[model samples]
Target: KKVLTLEGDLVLGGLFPVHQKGGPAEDCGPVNEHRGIQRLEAMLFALDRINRDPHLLPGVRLGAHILDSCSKDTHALEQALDFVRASLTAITGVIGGSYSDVSIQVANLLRLFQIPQISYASTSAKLSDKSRYDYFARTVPPDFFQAKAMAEILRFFNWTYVSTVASEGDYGETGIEAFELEARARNICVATSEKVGRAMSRAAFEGVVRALLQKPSARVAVLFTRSEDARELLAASQRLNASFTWVASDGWGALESVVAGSEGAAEGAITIELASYPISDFASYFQSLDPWNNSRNPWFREFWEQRFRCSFRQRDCAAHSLRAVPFEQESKIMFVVNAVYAMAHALHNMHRALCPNTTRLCDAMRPVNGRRLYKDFVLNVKFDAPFRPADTHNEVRFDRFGDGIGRYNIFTYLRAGSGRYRYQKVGYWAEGLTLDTSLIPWASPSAGPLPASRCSEPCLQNEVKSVQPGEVCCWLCIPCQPYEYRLDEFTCADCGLGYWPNASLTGCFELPQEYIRWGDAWAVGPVTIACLGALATLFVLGVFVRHNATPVVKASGRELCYILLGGVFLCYCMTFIFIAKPSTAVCTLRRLGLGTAFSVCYSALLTKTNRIASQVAICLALISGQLLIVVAWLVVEAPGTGKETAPERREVVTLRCNHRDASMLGSLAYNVLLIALCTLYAFKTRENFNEAKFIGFTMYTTCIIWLAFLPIFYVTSSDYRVQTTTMCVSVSLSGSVVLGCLFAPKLHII
Candidate 1:
C-alpha cells in the first residue's frame, strides 16, 4: 500500500497522480512532477501552514493518510480502501484525486462510505451533480465554465465552422463533449471530431488530419487533449503539413513539453486556463527539503532521484548534496491552498455548530463523523479564500453543488521573438470574459491572416439560404427568381398575383397594377388618329348637307349618305374607349358600340349597291340583326373589369375587362357576315354600277385591314396592353379607309 500516514489530530485521505502508468506495466509508471509530485507537496504545504496558525483550530491538529492514484482509474480506486480500513483512527475525509477520472472513481467510493471528499483539480461537469454522488466537491470550476469561455473565443473570431480532436481519457472526452454542446448552440458547425487513442500511435493519429482535409473550409481547430496527447498530435499533424489555428483548453498549454518539438503546429493557439498564481513563500518552503531528512514524505526519495538522476548513498551520485530545486509553479497550486483553507474553515464552523460556547475540543468532536459534520457545515461553509492578496479576490463558498467561482486566464500562443512562440497573457476570461482583440499577434492560418473558417460564404443580397439537412452551419444560397419572394434567410416561396420581392429578399411587397392610361405612349397614337377621323367624318356630313339637291348629292342619295357618315363617327368614338383604363362602363361600351357601328356603314353600302323597296328600312333592318346578337352576348357573360397577368413578365398584372377576348370575338363574327354580303353585292355590280366600283374597293381594302389585325391580336396574347392598343389602331384605320375611298370622289364632284 506504500503506507504513508501520520498519527496527528484529525486525518483526511489525500490522493494524487504521483505516477503515470500503462496496461503493460500491470501497475504504475514513473513520477509526474507537474501533476502529481508538486500537487502532493502543495497539499502538505497548505495544511502545515494552517496547523501552525494560532487563530484557526487553535489547539486541534490535522493529519492525512496520503496515497497516489498512479493516474489510472482502476489504480485510483484501489489505493483509497486503506482509508475505509483505518476508520476514525485516521481518515475522516478526503483531500484529493487530481484527474477527473480518478475523482469520479474515488468520489463514488467515498459516497459509498458516505465520507466527505474535496478535490483540487478534477473538473468534469457532472462532478457537481448532487443526485448521483452524495458528497463530492471541487476547488476548480467545472469544465462547463471552460466550455462556455471557449465559445466566447469562437464568437470573438467570428468563426462559424471548426474541427476538433480529443484524447480518449475522461478529462479530454468529457470536456470535448461539453464544448461540442456549447459550440452548436451559437450555430457554429464542426467540420469533424476525431479521437486520439489511449496509447495513440502516430499512424492512427494521422486519421485525424485526414478527416480535416476532407473539408478544408474550416481552418480553425479546437483541441480537448491531455498535454502529452497534444504533443504527439501536433507531432503527427506537422508531419502531414496540415496547419491550423487552434482554440485549446488548459489541458493543451503552458507546458513547453506539450508543443516542444512541434511548435510549428501550435502557433496561433488560444487557451483558457483556470486562473492561477504563485503563493508568497511556497518556493522557499520547497527549497529546504532533502531526500534523507524528509522521513514524513515516503515518496520524496523517488521524486529526488527522478529530478537529479541519482539514487540514495550511491558512489557515482553527487546529486544528494544538491538542494531540491522546485519546478515553475502551475495554476492548481493556488487551488490546493484554497481547498485546504476551505477544509480548515468548514471544520472550524462545524466545531462551532456542535459546541458554540466552548473554544476547545469536546467529547462529541473526539471521534469525527464525516457524514454529520459535512452535511451541517461543509456544504454550507463560507470564508475568505487564501492568496486573495486583494479585497476583491474574496469569498470561498460552495454553490448548491460545491463548485468554485468561475475565473480563467486568457492566453494566445504567439511569436514571442526570433522565430519562437510562447503563450502570453492577453486578458482574463474571468466568468464575464472580456477581450480586446487588437492586441493579439495572430499567426496566419494556412489560408488567411484572419482565418476564413466558415462552411458557406455570405449569400448574395437577393439570395436566400437553403440549409443542408441536419446541419445549420453549411448551406447553399438560392438567388430567388424575379417572381419569387423570400420566406426566411433559409427558404423562399413564389410570389402570388400582384406580389413582388423587395431587393433584400427579406419579404414580399404588393406589385404595381399596370394599365394603359390615357396619357400613355400607346394611347397618344390612337387618340390623335381618332380625333382626326371624327373631324373628317363631321366635315363630310356638313358637305353633304350644304349640297343637298346638287347633282352629285342627289345622285349619291341623301338618305343612305347621312347614315353612312353617322356610323363612321361612332367607329372613331370606339377608339377612345379602347385607349382608356378599364372599368365596368368602359368594358360594356366596347361591346355595345363595337359591332353596331360597322353594321350601319356596311348595310348602307350594301343597300346602295342593290336597290331596295324601302331604302331606309333596309339599312335599319341590317343594323337591327346586329343589335340583337350584341345584347344577347352581353347578357350571358357580362363585361366586368378584372386582372390579366403578362405571360412573359409574371410580376406585371394587367387590368382589363374579364370577358374581353371571347365576347369581343363573337361580336366581330356578326360584322364579318355583313362585310361578306357587302363584298358580294359590290362584286356582282362592279362593271355597270358606278357606285359599286368605288364601294367594292372600299370593302376590299377594309377586309384586308381586318385580316391583318386578326392574326396580330391573338398572337400578342402575352401582353394585354399591346393587344388593346392594336385593336384601337385597327378600328381607327377602318374608319379612315371608309372616309378616304367612298367620300373623296363625292366632294370633288360637288
Candidate 2:
C-alpha cells in the first residue's frame, strides 16, 4: 500500500485530538483517547452517505486522510504542512480543528496556498477576518455570538459584579476580550480578570485561585478557556471549598472531562453551547464500532482499549460488548457531518458550473486548482445541507467573512441524585441576536425564577429614576411633583390645564367640569325670586294703568312710574337668562336686558327728581344719555358667552356673562353719575314736600347696593353661579326699594 498515494484521490483531510497531553510540565495523565474520535467518525460517515447518494456527487468516490494533532498548535501546523506538501490535486479541503488556537495556526499556514479549510469546531472571532486568513471558514458561529450570549445571560440574572478566568492564548484572550467588551456595554462590572496558561504551572494556578478568592464581591465566575484549564480551576476551587456560581464559555462548556470530578462544585453551572441536532442513525452507527470487525478505522484498536480498559489481543474485549453500550450524539459530530456536506455541495456546484448542458462528466484526472476552487466553487457555494434526513431548511452558506450563521442553546448542568451530572436545555439564542428565555427553569426548587444580583431595586411607578453616583446599575427613586406625572424613569411632566394627577401621581386625567344647572338650589332660588318680582311689577303696572285719572297717580308722575315698572319687569325677566345655561343668544339677551332696564329705571328717577316743566323732554334726554353710555360700554367690553373656572376640587362649569374689569367699572361710572345727578337735584329741592324727598332716599339706597355689589362680584368671579345670583338679588332689591319708597306711598294715599 502506498501511503503517499495522491493521483485520482479526493482526500478529506482532518485534524483531531486522538490523545490528551499533560500541562507545561507534562506530568498530569494519559491521553483522553475518545476526545476527537467521534468527530472523525461523523466526517467519514457523511462521506460514505454522500458517495452512496446518486444525486449528490454522482459516480464520485471520496477518500479520507485523517490526522491526529494531539490538540496542540505545533502538531496541528505540522500535519497541515504534510497535507499541503502532498499532491495538491488529491486534497479537497481540511476539517476538524477542535480548538481555535490550533485552527488559527493551521489556517495562517494554509492561507499561503489558498487551500479551502473548513473547521467544524473552531469558533474564534479572528478566523472570520478574511483579510488575514482568506482560505479559512467555519461551520460554527464565531466567539462574538458566544460573547453576546454570555453577556445576555449575566444581564438576565442581574449579575453586575462578576469575575472572569481565561487561558493565556489566542482562544482565551480573544474570547474573553469580546466578552468584556459586551459586558461593559451592558453595565456589567468585571471585578477581576485572570489569565492562566494551557499548560499552567502549579504556582500560576494557585495565584489565579488566590485572586478569585480575594474578590468577595464576585459571586459569579465566568470561565473563558479550554476544558483542561477549566478543570484545573474547578479542582482547585473544590479543594479550597470555594462556592461560586459558574458560567462556562462555549469552549469547555460541554466537555465531559472538565465537569467529571467537579460535579458537586458545578451543580448549578450554566453554559452556552452549539445547538444539537438529531443525526439519522449516527448514534446507532457509533455504538456499533468494533475494533476486531472494523479494520478500516486505524485508530479503533487504541480507542477500544481505552474505552474498555482492556487490550484487543488479550480476548477480554469481547466481555465488554460494544453493542450493549449506548451512544449520545455530540454537537461537534453534527458540525463535522455538516462540514463534509458543505464540501460535497461545493464540489457539486463546481461540477454543475463546469459540465452544464452535457451528459459527459468533467475530467477527474486533472489536478484541482486550490485557488480556483476557493474562488469559483467553495466561496460561492450555497445549498440546503440537512443535519438530519428530515431537516430541509438548514442552508449552508458562508457570510462575506466566511463564518457560517449559527445558533446557540443554553444548558444548565445539574448533579443528579445518582452522582451523575447532566445538562438540561434551558433556552436558545437565534440568528438576529434574539434570545428565547421562556424555557429557562430555576436551578433549584427553592431558588427564584430569576436570581437577584442587582445593585438596587428598580424605580417603582409614580417615581422618577435618579442615577446613583458613579454607578450605572444603581439608582434612587424620587416622587413626582403635584399636578405633574412621571413620564418615564427619568423625568416628570405637567398635566394639561383641564387635567389633574391621579393619587399615585403616575398619570393624569381630565377634570369633570360643572355648571349651575336648573335643578341646583342656587339657580332655583334666583329663578323663584325673579318670578315673584316680575309678578309684583306687573301688578303695579296694572294699578297705575287703571288709576290714570286719579290725583295720586298723576301727582306721583304716572309716566315715570310706568317707565320704572317696565324697567323693573325687564330686570326681573333678565335674571332667568343668568340662571339658565348660557349660549350666544342668552349672553346677548342678558347684556341688553340688564343695561336697558337699569338705564330706564335711573332715567325715570332722574326725571322725577328734577321737577322740570317739560318732563317728557327731560326724561328723553336722560334716557338718551343712558342709552349712549350702554352702547359705548357694549362696543368696548364685548361681553358675551364665557366658561367658568373653578378650582380642581369643584367640577363645575358655570356659563355666565363675561365682563372685563374696565367695562364693568365704566358701566358702573355712568350709573353712579346718574345717581349723583338725581341726588343733587333731590337735595336742591330738599325744602319742598315733593317726590324729591323719596328720590333722594332711593338714590342713597342704590348707592349702598352698588358699593356692595362691586366687591362681592369680584370675589366670586370664579364661580359664575354665585356671581349671577348676587347680581339678580342686588337688582331686584334696588328696584323694590324705589317702587316702595316713591310710588307705593302715593298709591296708599290714593
Candidate 3:
C-alpha cells in the first residue's frame, strides 16, 4: 500500500462555469470574487503546508487532487459532491466550498461518504442542525452567534426598543431571526420589527423609515441587510428627522459602503464584523510580493467615483491604499496558514490514535487504510465549539463581533472618497454563552441533583446558582424562619395561621391579631365613629339651611349662634373627615372644637335657669300679700334686680335681650331658679282646704302650662334663638324646672 500526496494540480487547469445560465463569471460581484480568491489561496496553501509537515503521516506526504467545481452554478454543489464521492473515496475531508448553500450540500455528501469534512469559511446555521455526523466541522462560525452578539451589545446600551430592517436573503433571515430571539429572551422590545428586500428602492426605504418613526419608542434600528441597502435606509431615516442608531451584522461590515451613500448619517451608526487581523504593514508587504498589482480591478475605479465613499478620501490615495491593501492580503495569508496548521495537526492525531503500529503510519493514507482523519484534527486543534454538545454535525467557533468604543461595542465602518472600505472597532460584546433552555425554563424531571450537583451545592447555599448570562441569581436555600417553612429544598413557604415551622419549615407566619393588625388594620372601628360624626354634622347643617330652619333655631339658637354652633359642629365634622383624610391638623381641630362647644353651651343653660327662678320669687311675694312695702319695693326693683324683668320694661330700658353674654346667662339662671323655689314654696304654704285645693290645682295647672310654653317660647322667638348660646331644648328644660319649682310651693299649701 502506498500513501499518495499529489501536488501537481497547478499544472493541470480546468475551469467550469456554474452560473445559472452557463454565462461567463464576470457578472459575479467584486465581493464574491474577492471571497473566491481568498478561498482558493487557502486551499493551495493548506496542500503546501500538509506536504511539508512531517508530523501528519510520519514518512508519507499528502497530495492535492485539484478539481474546480463550477463557480456560481446551481449544479456546482452536485459536481463537487460527486467529485468527493467518486474520486476521493479515501479522502477524509475536502476544504473548498465557498457559499453557505454549497457548503451545506458538501456537508451532506460527506455524511453519505461517512468521512469527516471541515470548511474554512462556510457560515450557514442549518448544517449543524441537519445531523450529527460527528465528522463535520468548520473554522468560521455561523451567523447566529454574531447576530446574538449584536443584540446583546444593543441591550447593554439600554436600546431595548428597536426596529429591524432585513434584506430578503438567507444571511439576512438568519441574522434577523437570531437578533429577534436574543432581544425577546432578554425582554427587549423590538418595537418595529420588519424586513426589507435587497436593493430596496429609495421610496421603499423611505416608507420603512416612516413606519419606524411612527414607533415612538424605537430609537435604534437593527439592519440585517447589505451595506448598500442599509445606506438607503439610513439616509431615509435621517431625512425624516428620525435620529436612530443603526446596527448591522457582517453583511454590513463593509463600513465604507454604508457611509458612502448615507450622506453623513454613518457617524453614529454601528455594525458587527468577525474579529479581524491588524493589517497596517501587511498591505505594503503584499504589493512588493505581487508586482503585477492584479489586486486592483477596473470596477474599483467605479466604486471609488460613484460610491460616495467617505472613509478614505480619494485625495489621499496613499493612506486609502495603506488601509485597504492589507485586509485582502491578511485574509489570504493568515486564515489559510491557521487552517493548514490546524488541519495537519488533526490528521496527525487521528493517524496516531487509529494506528498503534508506529512503522505503518506512512502507508496508512491509502484507500480505507487511513483512519477517519478529521477526528484527530479536532482533538489536536483548539477552535471553540460552534455547535451544541448534543448536536451531531457540529462545526465552527462561537465568536462575537463588536465595535471597541463603548459598552454597546457595535461595528463601525467608513467609506472613503476613494471608495475603499475602512472598519473601525468602536464597540464590542464581551459576554459569553447563552442559557440552555432544554436544561432550564422547565422543572427538572430528575428526582434530585445529579452527581455534578455537588459542585453547585455550595453555590446554592450562597444563593449563587449559575444562571444564563443576564439572569437573576437564585436565592439562598437557608432553612425558613420560625414563621415560614421550606416549600421545597430550593424555596421556603410561609408558616400560615396556627401552623408553625420547626427549623427547615414551610407555610406562613402565625396569624395573631397584632400580626394581622400590623399587616393591615390601621383603619378600623374608631375611624368609623369619627367618620360618622363628621357626616352627621354635615347632614344636620345641610338640612337646616335647606328646610329645617325651625328645628335648627330651636336646637342651636340665633343665626350667629347657629354659625358658632355650626363652626363647633364643623370641628366635629372634621373628625370624620380626618378619619377619612387622616392628618395631624384635622385631629387637633376636632379636639379643640368639641371642647369649646361643650363649655359654652352648658354655661348658657345655667344662666337661663337662674333668670326664671328670680322672676317667680318676686311674683310669689306680691301674691302672698305679706310686707306690702317690701313687696312694692321688690316689684319696683324686680326689673333691676334680675335681667329677665328688663324684657317687660323694654320701653324704659333699651338693653338688648341676648342670652349669649356670660353675665346675662348667669343672671337669667338666678331668676329662673328663684321662680322654681317660690312656686313650690307657695303651694306647700296654702291654708284653706277648699281654697288651698283650688290654688294648688291652679298652680299645678300653671306649672304644666309653663313647662309646655318654654319649648314653644324658644322655638317661636327667632330673635332669642339667633342671639342665644343656649340650645332651645336646654333652655326649655331649664325653664320647665323653674316653673315646676315655682308652682310647687302653692300646691303644697293646698
Best by lDDT: 1
User: 1 or 2: which has the higher lDDT?
Assistant: 1
User: For model 3, what is the alpha-carbon lDDT of residue 475?
Assistant: 26
Q: Write one digit per residue (lDDT tens) for candidate 2, span 1-750.
A: 012222223666778776665656652234454457777677767887887778887755677777777778887787777777865335767876888888989888887776788888888888888888878878888999889889988887778988899888788888999999999888798878899876587678777888987977677899897877777788887877877788888866666654446667676678888876777677777777777687776666677877778765666877776677755566677778878888877777766777665422467424566677777677777777655567346777777787766688888776556666678677788753344444444544455655445444566665564644554545666775544544553545544534333334535544444444444564666667777777776767778668763766566445665566666666676666666555555544544455566667677767666554368567777677766666666673555545444455433445445653243565566556645655565466663455546667777766566666667677776354466356656666566656556566766755
- Estimated TM-score per prediction? 0.73, 0.59, 0.46
Give one digit per residue, the lDDT tens place, for model 3 in 31-107: 32334433443444455555654655554455444344433424545455544555453454555554455555655
Show the lowest summed lDDT stretch of 10 residues, model 3: 9-18
TM-score of predicted structure 1:
0.73
Question: Higher TM-score: candidate 2 or 3?
Answer: 2
> Which residue pairs overlap in candidate 1's backbone?
none
Shift of residue 466 alpha carbon in model 1, Å: 5.0
- Give the alpha-carbon lDDT of every model: 0.73, 0.69, 0.44
User: Ranking under lDDT, best-scoring first?
Assistant: 1, 2, 3
lDDT tens digits, residue span 118-214, model 1: 8988888878788877888777888888988988788777888898888786788888888989886876778888888766776788887788778
- Give lDDT: candidate 1, residue 713: 65
